[PDB]
Structure 1
Amino acid sequence: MMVISEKVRKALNDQLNREIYSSYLYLSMATYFDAEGFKGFVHWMKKQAQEELTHAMKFYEYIYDRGGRVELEAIEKPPSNWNGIKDAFEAALKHEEFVTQSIYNILELASEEKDHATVSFLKWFVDEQVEEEDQVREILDLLEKANGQMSVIFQLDRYLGQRE
């Protein structure tokens, strides 16, 4: 027996598909930074793409652990171009803020259904989203310090190029 309500399963399945989209979006930002020729920003976006995949697989495993099933949905085409580096990263910040709210919505729905297991499972994402937001604000802050000066952009490129 599936021991999550169907409406919590679809909320989880929906979030799983949003995590797949988030990974595709960062790959698309990588395509942008690669066209712009910043190998370090490219490197950073590829790691973010694979990191979001692990988020999706976390949802994957919990759905099956609670007796549900996963259904993959179509993945909409992401933007392929931005108005500069600050533009791409602010789009990332806004995006992760949307992801956090979508996860917040699942938590409140689970809490209202007295689904304590799903409430507890999502705490990892609550904490993780704090870090996903902060790291992008850090880059945005450093980018505003550079203020388009290429000597500093190279430093920030090579800094983000070291992400493991």
Structure 2
Amino acid sequence: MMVISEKVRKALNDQLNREIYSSYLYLSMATYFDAEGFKGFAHWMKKQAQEELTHAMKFYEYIYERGGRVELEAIEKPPSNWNGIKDAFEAALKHEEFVTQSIYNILELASEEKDHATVSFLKWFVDEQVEEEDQVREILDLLEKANGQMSVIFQLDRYLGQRE
């Protein structure tokens, strides 16, 4: 059997695939940062790529817990270049704002269908998306306040390069 509906199985599978793209996007942003000598922003993005894969593999395991199957879809080629560190991090946030709506959308579907086990599974991703967004809002506020003082940007590079 499948104790989840197929509209829900598919929204979950759709979201697993979105997390994979998100992982690959941030790896793409790391390539831009690495090319521009910002090895610390690059390490932050690599760490974030790995995080998205953790998100992806939570959806994977939930689908198999509830008797569905996962289908991997093609992954779009992501952007490889941005105009400045700010432009990249703004793209990060717009994407995370998009991931946040995607999750809200799946949670209303689950709620509409009264699949409340999926609602409670998704609550963890709702909370985490607030960190995911504020993470980036914090970096953007610091880049902004940097003016363009390269001493300050490099101070931020090095500290984001300590991400555990």
- Give the TM-score taking structure 1 as reference length: 0.99
Matches within 5 A, 1:113-124: 113-124=113-124
Asked if residue 29 in structure 1 is aligned to residue 32 in structure 2, the reply is no
Find the aligned partners of 2:148 and 2:39 in 1 and give their Cα distance.
17
**Aligned-partner Cα distance in 1 for 2:130–2:97:** 9
Report the CA distance between 1:58 and its aligned residue: 0.3
Partners of 1:63 and 1:148 in 2: CA distance: 46
Structure 2: give runs of 5+ residues left out of the alignment. none
1:120 Cα deviation after fit: 0.4
- 1:83, 1:104 → 2: CA distance? 31
The offset of 1:147, in angstroms, is: 1.5
Offset of 1:123 from its aligned partner? Answer: 0.4
Report how far residue 15 of structure 1 moved: 0.1
| 1:115 positional shift | 0.2
Distance of 2:31 and 2:53 partners within structure 1: 18
The separation in 2 between residues aligned to 1:2 and 1:122, in whole angstroms, is 18
Is the partner of 1:67 in helix, strand or coil?
coil
> CA RMSD, aligned part only?
0.4
Kindly provide the CA deviation profile for residues 94-132 of structure 1, in whole angstroms up to 9, marking residues without a partner as x: 000000000000000000000001000000000000100
Question: What do residues 80-100 of structure 1 show as CA deviations (whole Å, max 9, x unaligned)?
Answer: 000000000000000000000
For residues 39-75 of structure 1, the C-alpha deviation after alignment (integer angstroms, 9 at most, x for no partner) is 1001100000000000000000000000000000000
- Work out the CA distance in 1 between the residues paired with 2:92 and 2:136: 7
Residues in 1 aligned to 2:31 and 2:94: alpha-carbon distance in whole angstroms: 19
Q: How many residues align?
A: 164
2-side partners of 1:5 and 1:99: how far apart? 22
Distance 2:163 2:33 in 1: 16
> Does residue 42 of structure 2 align to residue 42 of structure 1?
yes
Give SS of 2:51's match: helix
**1:22 Cα deviation (Å)?**
0.1
Question: Taking every aligned residue pair, what percent have the same amino acid on both sides?
Answer: 99
Quote how far apart the aligned CAs of 1:159 are: 1.0
> How high is the TM-score relative to the length of structure 2?
0.99
- Distance (whole Å) between structure 2 residues aligned to residue 106 and residue 21 of structure 1: 18
- Stretches of structure 1 that go unaligned for 5 or more consecutive residues are none
Counterparts of 1:82 and 1:154, CA distance in 2: 18
